[PDB]
Amino acid sequence: GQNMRVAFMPWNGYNFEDSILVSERVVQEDRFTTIHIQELACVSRDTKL
Amino acid sequence: EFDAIKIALASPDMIRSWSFGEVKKPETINYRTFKPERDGLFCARIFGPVKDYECLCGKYKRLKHRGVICEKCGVEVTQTKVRRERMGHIELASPTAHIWFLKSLPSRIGLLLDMPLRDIERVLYFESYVVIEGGMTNLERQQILTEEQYLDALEEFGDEFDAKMGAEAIQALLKSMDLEQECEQLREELNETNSETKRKKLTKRIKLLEAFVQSGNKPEWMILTVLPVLPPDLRPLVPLDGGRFATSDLNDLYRRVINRNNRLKRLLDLAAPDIIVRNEKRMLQEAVDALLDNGRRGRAITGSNKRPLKSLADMIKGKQGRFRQNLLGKRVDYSGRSVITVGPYLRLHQCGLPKKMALELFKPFIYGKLELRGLATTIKAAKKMVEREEAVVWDILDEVIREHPVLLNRAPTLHRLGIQAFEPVLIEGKAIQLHPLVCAAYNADFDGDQMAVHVPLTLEAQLEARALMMSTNNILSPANGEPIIVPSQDVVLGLYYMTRDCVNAKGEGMVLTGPKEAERLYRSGLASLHARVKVRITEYEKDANGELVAKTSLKDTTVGRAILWMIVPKGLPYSIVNQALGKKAISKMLNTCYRILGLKPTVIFADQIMYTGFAYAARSGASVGIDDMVIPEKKHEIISEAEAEVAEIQEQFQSGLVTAGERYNKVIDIWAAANDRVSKAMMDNLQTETVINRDGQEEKQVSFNSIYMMADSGARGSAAQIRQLAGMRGLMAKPDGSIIETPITANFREGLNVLQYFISTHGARKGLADTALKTANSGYLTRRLVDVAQDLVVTEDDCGTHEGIMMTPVIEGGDVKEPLRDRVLGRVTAEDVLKPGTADILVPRNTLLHEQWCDLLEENSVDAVKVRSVVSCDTDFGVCAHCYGRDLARGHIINKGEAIGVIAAQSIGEPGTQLTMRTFHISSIQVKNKGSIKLSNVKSVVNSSGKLVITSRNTELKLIDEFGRTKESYKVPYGAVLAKGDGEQVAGGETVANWDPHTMPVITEVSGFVRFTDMIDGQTITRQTDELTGLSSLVVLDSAERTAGGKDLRPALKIVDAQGNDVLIPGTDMPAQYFLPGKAIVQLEDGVQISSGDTLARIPQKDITGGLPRVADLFEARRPKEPAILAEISGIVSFGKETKGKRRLVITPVDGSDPYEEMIPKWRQLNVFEGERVERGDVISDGPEAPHDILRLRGVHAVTRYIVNEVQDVYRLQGVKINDKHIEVIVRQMLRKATIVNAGSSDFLEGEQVEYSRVKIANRELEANGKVGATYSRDLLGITKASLATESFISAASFQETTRVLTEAAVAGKRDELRGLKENVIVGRLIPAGTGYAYHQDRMRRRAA
Amino acid sequence: SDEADEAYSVTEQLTMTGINRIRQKINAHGIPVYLCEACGNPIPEARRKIFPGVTLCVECQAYQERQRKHYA
Amino acid sequence: DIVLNPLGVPSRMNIGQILETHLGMAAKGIGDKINAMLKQQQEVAKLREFIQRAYDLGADVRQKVDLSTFSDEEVMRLAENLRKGMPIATPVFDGAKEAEIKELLKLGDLPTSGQIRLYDGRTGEQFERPVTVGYMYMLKLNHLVDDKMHARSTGSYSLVTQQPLGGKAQFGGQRFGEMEVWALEAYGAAYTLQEMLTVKSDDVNGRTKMYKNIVDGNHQMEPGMPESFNVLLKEIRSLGINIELED
Amino acid sequence: GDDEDSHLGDFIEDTTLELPLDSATTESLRAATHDVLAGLTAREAKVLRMRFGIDMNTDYTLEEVGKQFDVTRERIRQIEAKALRKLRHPSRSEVLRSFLDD
Amino acid sequence: ARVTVQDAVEKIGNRFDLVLVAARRARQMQVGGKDPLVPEENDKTTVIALREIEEGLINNQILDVRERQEQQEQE
Ligand SMILES: [Mg+2]
Ligand SMILES: [Zn+2]
Ligand SMILES: [Zn+2]
Ligand SMILES: [Zn+2]
């Protein structure tokens, strides 16, 4: 993970049941960006036509 | 379009008329050019073309040749959809019995001919022969012979006798048989003969014959002479990736039938050796049965990949079949799915819908609106624009979205509030923002849960999301009127922090001129949210006729309550906000806002409450720290005392003073007491510990501990969980209930060492695994109750009856548990209810008792009110609008077309999710308050002693004060020594009666000498020696050890005068003697006195289940194992032959069938005397009551009251609340069956179980006539058998054994008039329940014009 | 709520009913017998003082405890 | 950086999370001091002194570390890697006791109560009742919303049972199961149910006919009969059971 | 190997069905061509509906069109070429052409 | 928009009669030709027909007699 500076407090309902109210410096500083490597594939089979 | 679904057998001519051509070869396709081979299992000549409007060769491809049958390959040029409806037929060269009609158990073939099953299957496989009208020589019609028997028959009986073999013989047998002739013979055997069970089975066969005649079926159609093959596009053979095809197993099964059929044709035209021909016929029969229902005669074949090939029967039946998994619930377009987040800014009717998730759901509407506004020339330009997300598409989308609701639905939709309609709000993101207040409805939090979105497309479907399924119309739970818009956890804590007070805060004690000034003081920073203060508030009251009379005054409130008062709507009082506002109080405030101001003010109050709660919770900064779990410093000395007592017990165990189990129990008791002590210490340290100064020294108030605030406000917590954080964790438990004696004396604030943690993991994993099932088998009770109680619909505004239930408070034990206002609120009365002095005509008959009439009822302290119930409603095929009362949620009165059955099942099953998945178990009256005595079964005598004694059996005594209301109820035994007797109004601190379980008296009527008549010791009495008092006792016993000479004889105690005459029992001329059964010690002598009910014979010496199984069993209506036998008839009782397990209990009525008698299990403690007049509908031995017993004895209201009270016991045990309308509906479906006692002028069988509604209507229309109706007797079934009997075979095949249902329908030739909720859904029509109920009424009016 | 949040109520009911039945097994009232109801011997002052309202001597209690241990 | 609900601690009895908030605040407070010392350059002596204080700091522990066996530039690599906060070990049932946490807080210049006063970002005012603020280690599970979110209006359909199939993982619509049918029978929503099981799912003509009506500005359907029921009729009739539809 | 006890027969898609965007992209084309043909004399309109299969049964050859018009095939070819020329220009081509995403 | 249909319920009684009567009127306006009896606030046909039902000037008897009048004048 990442060690984030969390404050335990309500703040206007934006963490109501178990939501998390994350600041915009956390997505600015890119400390939860992840890299995801999909693989697509194109097979050229031999149809009757 | 189409009326009912007709069903029957299939004539071979009808099966040849279905088909579009025979199937002669087992060829699917060619292996190089994958065109259908023939004249095979995939054929273009039979099953239409394999490409649209295209012949097979290619000679005809244009549309102009539409319909042509091509000259070359005879392939009719038409659509390829045609390949999905045309059927073929295989022509079985030999007959072949339908396995459905040979293993249906009873075998329809078998029970039609009256030939037992093994004989049929022995003639079937050529094991034997069966004669078929074997001439006028020797034999019976269905006389089966062995092989050599037939061989010798052909010698001595050459011709004029014909016995066949195999399915050909069964075909000839069914064919030659004439149904009316045999039916006559059955008439003669049924009415000229009396052998009860033989005639039961006889009449069953008779009914089957009459059904086979009523229908158009012919018995010889149960033998498949012609076999139809499914259309190819239902059993397709599809090209996969790599050229390896994919086929449904039906192609394998059709191929195996076709090869064997062709080989049988071959062998037949070779004159082959007839044993080989027998084998071919047998194999073909087995193949046809694997094709029709595999694994129904032998072992499933096979399959090719070692798994049982599925056949057509498997295609219908099974949980993974066709009636269930794509017929009732299917996949759906115009729907999405996303992670839900919260978004507290939404209004209660709207939800955030991602732009990306909305541009895909409304693409049709967006294309239409683009092409309409001219922004795009055509649908293709529109599609391109949306595909590149032009700038204008977001305006077009905001216009499509505006009034268009969408259905939001969570996964386990337990109750109907799980599919709610919202208006969308195009939000940026990829997560649905769901309004906080709804999450209690959905039972949904934001730990990653997801929801599905659907678009109600059509006009009539998108006014139902607006008028029925919308989020704002649904604020009340249908299981109980309480609003489910309860603010849950941040809101109740914001409101708790707001509306509270501190002993001395900034700006305490300053007069304010209104809520506005309080808010301006708080925002300015000059006065705290809880500072005691006086504010002039003006509250309104609409007890006037709609008018709100105002009133202003200087309330002594705080700044928090002041600021909160601005939010409250007009007509509410100020006491609603002038307490500390927990969670319970917070939802009571909403309930009062509803019950005063209707729906719209409450809907606005909800989100106002929510916004202001979140705002002030955030203002409060209420965090939680590790110092907020203040452990009490008295915990160590309490634990030292506990360890000391435990060491004391260990020493007393090593000393030889207690067993091992006793030391275990004493240790657990010590540790439990110590845990309660430490928790009380930590709570006393937590709750009040805040100590402050007001003008001087000091003062304590309710603590501001953050964790205590969460525990007390009701947001989150209890005493148990805070105790585990602060006190001790107490004793863990192993999974099987085995409580560990080593208690975790630590909390989570301080550490937990390794051993305590490992101990706790036991119960932890048991709880986890248990909720891993209770989630998996989530809604099985709602499913079982939507099966039995589905097709009820409120279909009439009034049936106009006068029958109901005498609803009263459940005043059990002490004070009531459920008052009258809970249980009579919302139901229409059955009869005009007057005051106790009657004073007026208080409440009319058909007035819906809303809140005002309940006010009226508990001003006058009305105790019993008759209120109409749904189990007594006289409607036909439904329930009147008034015999259901007020409907929750919507809260006015149920309008005809409510599907009250589905709602009743869902309301009994969503609450049941909150119950335990396991079934778990659990001198002088301390009478409580002042009041008067109340007698039921008043037969008491005042002894010479002066106190009272119940000379009756079941005298029930109640303490009833000057209120008119009953305040205490009690069951009094047979003649306890009552300190207080009859009608004696007394107060608290005065016991109503003393008794003793070692003392059950046999008190008499009069005073006098107790002579001993009919008493000779050695045969009925026992020699109990008075080593305790210094006398002799002859105690009454039965024939258990005394010989049989005088064993049945009872020891009679003759209560007579001083002269010797038999003093009668006052009331009956039988004198005052008593015949005594055992268990009552006699301390008298012969020729001895007793006072007015002196001690003649003295008899010496609460667990409740609560699991959801205790509701599935309460509804399933089974029989307990200690079944309290009741009093079947009134009159007197006699005891007869004993020592058998059934001692004769004769009941001689007053004027009825006097020799009536029953059996008694003499292992039981029989608790009634033989001289007392038995009352019908009364208990004899004491134990759990049986439902069927009550239903036969006391009436339908008796069984309904019992079932309702038991289910309400198990529901109130866990605090879970559910109304009783729903259980009354489940019962009304439960006792749906009548039974014919007397045939009468009616036209049902003698002892036939018929639908009670049927007998009701028939005998009612006869009562209108001059003929005597049928005297019915109401049955009582379990839900899984009250659902088994359903009129429409579609629904029955849906939720039952499908093969049994379709076989019964096929033979009977039933016609399914689609008039049930579960049938119409299957056939795609409107359910005749809600919005489509008017449509179905118009359909019923069109039919029979 | 989460699967760990109703599992708590399950475990809570479980330990609660367990402790309840066990501390109901104990006897707190007083009906001084002074003699066992199985072997007739006087229940001594010590044992009858630990458990008020004890109804059986030590060894009869052990016997019945074992017998019920087999569930017979 | 992150704001978490306080109410999830009492109900869900995991005091570990607030204890770790406190200890992380301590561990970042011992890193802030090192960072300040490293930017207003003092010298390796005083920096070494403070790190040696922070490294002993407890009861009898087996973490005997002494910064005298460290080359002066071996203390600046360490002093750089402790700039963003010092790590802290805490074996499972052998952890740091609360007194150790308070002492490590006091060694930094944080409040011993583990709690700070905080001001609203918007109104600039001060929250009453100081709040827990600390550095907590937060993981990002791969229940990413970029995979959970999907939607469909009209896509592919299965070949045998002509229902929405999809296959874009997953362009198939949502499964309107049985409990949802009961939920819509509970309301009187007959039209919603009907379109939800014939026009949006099964009926092959009604759906292509309604996609035209939606585009034509006409919101109204002709439902017809589901191909599930047509298939069921064909299969029952493909037994010996003649099942027909009485007009 | 799925959660719903799914089978291989549930994922076999359908390659013959025409998507309802591709039926509403054919009815739109029928309406567009009926419009653009209405902007024309009965000569061109009738001869084009007859030469092609537009709103009619089997498209006839040139000789059948001529027998319906009592004129020889080359006149029919000239007429249809005239009409297609007239339709090729914008004001008669903009609406049809948008049906061509090529 | 329209948050509650509580007022429209009292004008028609049944909550299903209301839906079937309002869908009828809103389809009259949608397809088509007929006009709203109330100043449309940039609403859709559904909420327009609901709001007209709120004001008592739309219901089953009124809509049916409006049917009869045009059936007459269609001749
Ligand atoms: Mg969850
Ligand atoms: Zn051909
Ligand atoms: Zn009724
Ligand atoms: Zn003993």
**HEC letters along B90-159:** ECCCCCCECHHHCCCCCCHHHHHHCCCHHHHHHHHCCCCEEECCCCCCCCCCCCEECHHHHHHHHHHCCC
Taking the C-alpha atoms of residue A13 and residue A19, their distance in angstroms, rounded to an integer, is: 9
Q: Contact partners of C by the rule of 3+ C-beta pairs under 8 A? A: B, D
Question: What's at A49, amino acid-wise?
Answer: L
Residues of chain A by 3-state class (helix, strand, coil), percent to 5:
10, 20, 70
- Asked if D11 has any chain C CB less than 8 Å from its own CB, the reply is yes
Taking the C-alpha atoms of residue B704 and residue B541, their distance in angstroms, rounded to an integer, is: 35
**How big is chain D, counted in residues?**
247
Taking the C-alpha atoms of residue B79 and residue B432, their distance in angstroms, rounded to an integer, is: 43
CA distance C32 to chain B (A): 16
Whether B407 and B465 have beta carbons less than 8 Å apart is answered as: yes
Cβ neighbors of B506 (< 8 A, separation 6 or more) are B526, B527, B528, B531
* B38 strand-pairing partners: B43
Whether B95 and B109 have beta carbons less than 8 Å apart is answered as: no
DSSP H helical segments within B622-753, as ranges?
Answer: 635-654, 660-687, 706-713, 719-726
Taking the C-alpha atoms of residue B370 and residue B397, their distance in angstroms, rounded to an integer, is: 10
Q: Give the β-pairing of B1052-1056 and B1008-1013.
A: antiparallel
CA distances to B572, B583, B1063, B1083, C41 from B1026, in Å? 75, 66, 29, 8, 21
Residue of E nearest to B64 (CA): E58
Taking the C-alpha atoms of residue B1186 and residue B781, their distance in angstroms, rounded to an integer, is: 22
Taking the C-alpha atoms of residue B512 and residue B532, their distance in angstroms, rounded to an integer, is: 11
Q: Give the β-pairing of D174-176 and B956-960.
A: unpaired
E32 closest CA partner among E87, E102, E89, E101: E87
3-class DSSP state of B1274: strand
Which residue in C2, C5, C6 has the most chain B C-beta atoms within 10 A of its own C-beta, making it the best mutation to test that interface?
C6
DSSP H helical segments within B133-248, as ranges?
Answer: 147-156, 166-176, 179-191, 196-214
Strands of B1233-1236's sheet, edge to edge?
Answer: B1249-1251, B1233-1236, B1272-1274
If one counts the domains in chain F, the total is 1
Element holding E85 (H helix, E strand): helix E73-88
Please tell me whether residues B957 and B993 are part of one structural domain.
yes
Question: What's at B1198, amino acid-wise?
Answer: A
- Asked if F31 has any chain D CB less than 8 Å from its own CB, the reply is yes
- What CATH number is given to the structural domain containing B1048? 2.40.50.100
What is the C-alpha end-to-end distance of chain A, expressed in Å? 54
Q: Where are the domains of chain C?
A: 1-72
Nearest 5°: the CA angle F45, F46, F52 is 85
Whether B742 and B759 have beta carbons less than 8 Å apart is answered as: yes
Cβ atoms within 10 A of the Cβ of B550, count? 10
CA distances to B133, B155, B166 from B162, in Å? 7, 13, 13
Give the number of C-alpha atoms closer than 13 A to the C-alpha of residue B1269, restricted to the C-beta side. Answer: 15
D151 closest CA partner among E9, B463, B406: B406
Whether D219 and D213 have beta carbons less than 8 Å apart is answered as: yes
* B90 strand-pairing partners: B227
DSSP H helical segments within B860-922, as ranges?
Answer: 900-909
**How big is chain A, counted in residues?**
49
Q: CA torsion sign, D73 to D77 to D78 to D79?
A: positive
> Given an 8 Å threshold on Cβ–Cβ distance, is D217 in contact with F15?
no
Instruction: Give chain B positions within 8 Å (CB) of C3.
Output: 768, 771-772, 775
Task: Give the distance from CA B302 to its chain's centroid.
Answer: 40
Torsion of CA E81, E84, E86, E91, to 10 degrees: -170
Range(s) of the domain holding residue F55: 1-75
* B1036 strand-pairing partners: B1021
- Closest by Cβ to D154, choosing from E14, E19, E27: E19
Question: What's at C6, amino acid-wise?
Answer: E
Taking the C-alpha atoms of residue B616 and residue B634, their distance in angstroms, rounded to an integer, is: 36
Instruction: Give chain A positions within 8 Å (CB) of D8.
Output: 18
* B934 strand-pairing partners: B958
What is the C-alpha end-to-end distance of chain D, expressed in Å? 70
B107 closest CA partner among B124, B91, B95: B124
C62 CA from centroid of ligand 4 (Å) = 9
* B409 strand-pairing partners: B419, B452
Please tell me whether residues B1035 and B1074 are part of one structural domain.
yes
Cβ neighbors of B1097 (< 8 A, separation 6 or more) are B1001, B1002, B1036, B1053, B1074, B1076, B1080, B1081, B1082
Cβ atoms within 10 A of the Cβ of B644, count? 11
Q: Give the β-pairing of B237-238 and B87-90.
A: unpaired
Is the bond preceding B889 in cis, omega lying within 30 degrees of 0? yes
Whether D212 and E29 have beta carbons less than 8 Å apart is answered as: no
DSSP B423: E
Which residue in D205, D211, D214, D221 has the most chain E C-beta atoms within 10 A of its own C-beta, making it the best mutation to test that interface?
D211
CA distances to B364, B536, D168 from E17, in Å? 18, 74, 17
DSSP for B953-980, written as a single string: SS-EEEEE-TTSS--EEEE--TT-EESS
Query: Largest Cα–Cα distance of chain F, in whole Å?
Result: 42
Is the bond preceding B988 in cis, omega lying within 30 degrees of 0? no
Residues 4-63 of C with CB under 8 A from B: 4, 6-15, 17-23, 25-26, 44, 46-47, 50-51, 58, 61-62
- Closest by Cβ to E13, choosing from D161, D165, D215: D165
Taking the C-alpha atoms of residue B1103 and residue B572, their distance in angstroms, rounded to an integer, is: 44
Please tell me whether residues B669 and B706 are part of one structural domain.
yes
- Closest by Cβ to D218, choosing from F16, F19, F31: F31
Tokens of D230: 């047509």
Taking the C-alpha atoms of residue B777 and residue B769, their distance in angstroms, rounded to an integer, is: 13
Taking the C-alpha atoms of residue B54 and residue B503, their distance in angstroms, rounded to an integer, is: 92
Give the number of C-alpha atoms closer than 13 A to the C-alpha of residue B761, restricted to the C-beta side. Answer: 7
Please tell me whether residues B984 and B1044 are part of one structural domain.
no
Taking the C-alpha atoms of residue B315 and residue D236, their distance in angstroms, rounded to an integer, is: 10
Residue with tokens 């449309």: F40
B451 closest CA partner among B326, B352, B349, B362: B352
The neighbourhood of ligand 4, an ion, using CB within 5 A, equals C 36, 38-39, 56-57, 60
Question: What's at B1233, amino acid-wise?
Answer: K
Phi and psi based region of residue B1141 (left: phi greater than 0; alpha: psi -120 to 50; beta: remaining): left
B1144 closest CA partner among B1131, B1130, B1155, B1129: B1155
Cβ neighbors of B944 (< 8 A, separation 6 or more) are B1007, B1091, B1092, B1094
Taking the C-alpha atoms of residue B570 and residue B578, their distance in angstroms, rounded to an integer, is: 16
Whether B660 and C65 have beta carbons less than 8 Å apart is answered as: yes
CA distances to B533, B548, B730 from B513, in Å? 11, 22, 53
Taking the C-alpha atoms of residue B253 and residue B233, their distance in angstroms, rounded to an integer, is: 16
Tokens of B437: 């207040």
What is the C-alpha end-to-end distance of chain C, expressed in Å? 43
Tokens of A30: 């890119």
CA distance E66 to chain D (A): 38
CA distances to A36, B272, B798, B804, B898 from B873, in Å? 65, 72, 9, 8, 16
Taking the C-alpha atoms of residue B686 and residue B675, their distance in angstroms, rounded to an integer, is: 16
Please tell me whether residues B988 and B1006 are part of one structural domain.
no
A8 closest CA partner among B1272, B284, D15: D15
CA distances to B518, B1151, B1172, B1173, B1175 from B1130, in Å? 75, 10, 10, 7, 4
Nearest 5°: the CA angle E87, E93, E98 is 145
- Tally of helices (H runs) and strands (E runs) in chain A: 1, 2
Q: Is B412 exposed, middle or buried (0-12, 13-18, 19+ CB in 10 A)?
A: middle
Q: Is B567 exposed, middle or buried (0-12, 13-18, 19+ CB in 10 A)?
A: middle
* B689 strand-pairing partners: none
- Asked if F16 has any chain B CB less than 8 Å from its own CB, the reply is yes
Phi and psi of B595, rounded to 5°? Answer: -70, -5
> Given an 8 Å threshold on Cβ–Cβ distance, is D212 in contact with E20?
yes
Question: What's at B61, amino acid-wise?
Answer: K
3-class DSSP state of C72: coil
Taking the C-alpha atoms of residue B85 and residue B88, their distance in angstroms, rounded to an integer, is: 10
Cβ neighbors of A30 (< 8 A, separation 6 or more) are none
Question: What's at B657, amino acid-wise?
Answer: L
Taking the C-alpha atoms of residue B795 and residue B781, their distance in angstroms, rounded to an integer, is: 26
Experimental technique behind these coordinates? cryo-EM
Torsion of CA B175, B181, B187, B189, to 10 degrees: -80
Task: Give the distance from CA B175 to its chain's centroid.
Answer: 48
Q: CA torsion sign, B384 to B387 to B390 to B395?
A: positive
Whether B900 and B1315 have beta carbons less than 8 Å apart is answered as: no
Tokens of F44: 């859709």
DSSP D195: I
- What CATH number is given to the structural domain containing B1305? 1.10.150.390
DSSP for B31-49, written as a single string: SSS-SB-BSSSSBTTTS--
Taking the C-alpha atoms of residue B1131 and residue B798, their distance in angstroms, rounded to an integer, is: 40
B609 CA from centroid of ligand 1 (Å) = 25
Phi and psi based region of residue B1060 (left: phi greater than 0; alpha: psi -120 to 50; beta: remaining): left
Range(s) of the domain holding residue B941: 923-1000
Q: CA torsion sign, E54 to E57 to E63 to E67?
A: negative
Question: What's at B687, amino acid-wise?
Answer: Q
**How big is chain B, counted in residues?**
1345
- What CATH number is given to the structural domain containing F31? 3.90.940.10
CA distance A43 to chain B (A): 10
Whether B491 and B1226 have beta carbons less than 8 Å apart is answered as: no
Tokens of B791: 């097709």
The neighbourhood of ligand 1, an ion, using CB within 5 A, equals B 447, 449
Task: Give the distance from CA B1190 to its chain's centroid.
Answer: 21
CA distances to B18, B206, B728, B1003 from B979, in Å? 88, 68, 48, 16
> Cα-atom radius of gyration of chain C, to the nearest Å?
18
- What CATH number is given to the structural domain containing B669? 1.10.132.30
Question: Over the range D137-162, which residues count as b (16 or more CB within 10 Å of their CB) and which as e?
Answer: ebeeeeeeeeeebbbbbbbbbbbbbb
Whether B432 and B339 have beta carbons less than 8 Å apart is answered as: yes
CA distances to B473, B540, B543, B588, B927 from B572, in Å? 21, 7, 11, 12, 40
Give the number of C-alpha atoms closer than 13 A to the C-alpha of residue B1132, restricted to the C-beta side. Answer: 10
- Binding-site positions of E for Mg(2+): 94, 97
> Given an 8 Å threshold on Cβ–Cβ distance, is F31 in contact with D188?
no
Element holding B550 (H helix, E strand): strand B549-558
Whether B895 and F15 have beta carbons less than 8 Å apart is answered as: yes
